[PDB]
Structures are given as C-alpha cells and as structure tokens.
Design a protein around this motif. Structure first.
Motif, PDB file in Angstrom:
ATOM      1  N   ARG A 138       0.782  -1.231   0.000  1.00  0.00           N
ATOM      2  CA  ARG A 138       0.000   0.000   0.000  1.00  0.00           C
ATOM      3  C   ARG A 138       0.825   1.298   0.000  1.00  0.00           C
ATOM      4  N   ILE A 170       1.971   2.008  -3.650  1.00  0.00           N
ATOM      5  CA  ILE A 170       0.874   2.564  -4.423  1.00  0.00           C
ATOM      6  C   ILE A 170       0.627   4.016  -4.026  1.00  0.00           C
ATOM      7  N   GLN A 207      -4.095   5.280  -2.250  1.00  0.00           N
ATOM      8  CA  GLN A 207      -4.625   3.965  -2.462  1.00  0.00           C
ATOM      9  C   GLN A 207      -6.077   3.884  -1.929  1.00  0.00           C
ATOM     10  N   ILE A 219      -1.813   1.115 -11.090  1.00  0.00           N
ATOM     11  CA  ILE A 219      -2.124   0.019 -10.184  1.00  0.00           C
ATOM     12  C   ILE A 219      -1.683  -1.285 -10.851  1.00  0.00           C
ATOM     13  N   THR A 235       2.135  -1.477 -11.629  1.00  0.00           N
ATOM     14  CA  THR A 235       2.895  -1.752 -10.396  1.00  0.00           C
ATOM     15  C   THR A 235       2.729  -3.217  -9.990  1.00  0.00           C
ATOM     16  N   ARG A 236       1.515  -3.716 -10.154  1.00  0.00           N
ATOM     17  CA  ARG A 236       1.205  -5.111  -9.890  1.00  0.00           C
ATOM     18  C   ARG A 236       2.113  -6.033 -10.715  1.00  0.00           C
TER      19      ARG A 236
END
Lengths: 139, 135
Positions: free
Chosen positions: B16, B19, B30, B100, B103-104
């Motif tokens: 978190r 993000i 986030q 998102i 980054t994942r």
C-alpha cells in the motif's frame, strides 16, 4: 492475479476482526492490542521508531496510542540510559497473557485447515512479493 | 510460520505504501482508489452505507474519502446520500488503473503463474476458515 492485493488486504482485515471479536471483553481497540503485543515481544533497549516499524503505524499515531495506554495504567514511560523507555505494568500482566493467548491460538485454528508443506510455500511467496516491493520503493 | 500473520500484515502495508507513493503525482491515495474502483464497478447511486458494505470498511472513514473525491470533482452526492461518478472521473480512473496494474506486474515480477494460483488458493482457504470461526 488482478485481485491478489485486495484478497491479501481482506485476509488481514478479517483475521484481525476475529481477534477483535475474541478480545471483546477487555474493551481494547485493535490498535491497542496490536501495540501491546508488539511492546511485549520487542527487545528491551530498542527505539520507538523500531516499535512503530514492528506495529506498522506512523509515529504520530504511535504517540497517541501510548498516551492512551498510559492513561489506562497499562504502561509507564522512563528516561533510559540509551529517547524514552516503555515499560508494561503489573496491572497489564493478565491482559498481555490474554492478548498473547488469543493471537497464538487464533493462528493455530486458522492454520488448522492447511498443511505445514502448504504454509512453507505461502511464507516463501509472501517473502518473495515483499522483496519485490522493497526493491521497487528503493527505486 | 509462527510469524505468518505478521508477515502478511507487513506485506499489505508496504504494498500500500508503494501505491501511495506512485499515485502522488496525481494527488490520490490507495484509499481514494479503492473507493473509486468500487463505485465504478457498482450500479450508480449507491448510498454511503451500501458503499462501505461493498468496500468493507466503516462509514466515517469512507465519508472523509468521499468528501475529498467530491472536492476534486470526481464524484457528486445527492438526496441517504447517493453517490455518482462525474465525467471528469473517467480519465482519472484509467490513469490510476494504469499505475495500479502496472505496479502489480512488477510486484509479481519473476514469479510463476502456478505460484500465483497456489497463492490465491491458500488465501481463499484461510479466509473461509476465518469466516467459519466468526460463527
């Protein structure tokens, strides 16, 4: 894959909620029991930055939490020969054991479904993901 | 093993923060994102209570978040207070979703799809055992 971050968050939220329910009688906040557990687990001479790192909250929130816990007679604070040192009270003794006991056996029941061969692969993967995030945040 | 709970909580936490860090050019957190994503996947005009239920949090925290999103012109509220996305919110959501999901892809860098499937199975099983125990 696309919901894995959420599923991980929800797992934690829902695990902690159960502990909350089990600890209902003691009239503690979730931040309180998490703090109290980490105070009791951490080595003696360690810094408040480090206590905050163990718990997973920011310093301003840790300050407020310690004030509240001192108010309730569960901790004292003392000038150390090493910054201020956090000491659990005699009064806290029964609460700490109750907090520890629930955390410890809640984990066992939750783990009860799965095998040790399965948690091994789970720990390894959690560690892998963490490494990846640390690396990226550094960059 | 005996630090499984802690390890999981640390993971979610640093995930978190990353993000948060990456959304900063957009001035969003986030938390802002989770709210927008949920609003976006639901039929329009959920009440604050309905949204808190779907997201899985309590109302005051959500109300603060809705206040911020409204001031940024991403949602409106009508009269229960019922929530609606603005037309300005649609590009912002694609942009946030780009960060998102990109980054994942990096966080899942170098781990197999077998591993992701086994990871998902194990999380699901743990959550099920926990919801059994809450009764």
């Amino acid at each position: 894959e696309s919901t894995l971050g959420s599923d991980l968050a929800r797992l934690v939220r829902v695990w902690r909620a159960l502990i909350d329910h089990r600890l209902k009688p003691l009239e503690l906040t979730q931040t309180h029991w998490v703090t109290l557990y980490n105070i009791n687990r951490l080595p003696p001479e360690q810094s408040q930055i480090q206590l905050a790192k163990a718990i997973g909250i920011e310093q301003p929130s840790l300050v407020r939490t310690l004030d509240q816990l001192e108010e309730k007679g569960l901790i004292t604070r003392h000038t150390s020969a090493n910054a201020k040192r956090i000491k659990l009270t005699e009064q806290s003794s029964p609460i700490i054991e109750q907090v520890d006991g629930v955390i410890s056996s809640t984990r066992k029941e939750i783990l009860g479904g799965i095998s040790s061969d399965e948690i091994a692969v789970l720990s390894g993967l959690i560690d892998k993901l963490e490494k990846n995030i640390i690396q990226l945040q550094t960059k």
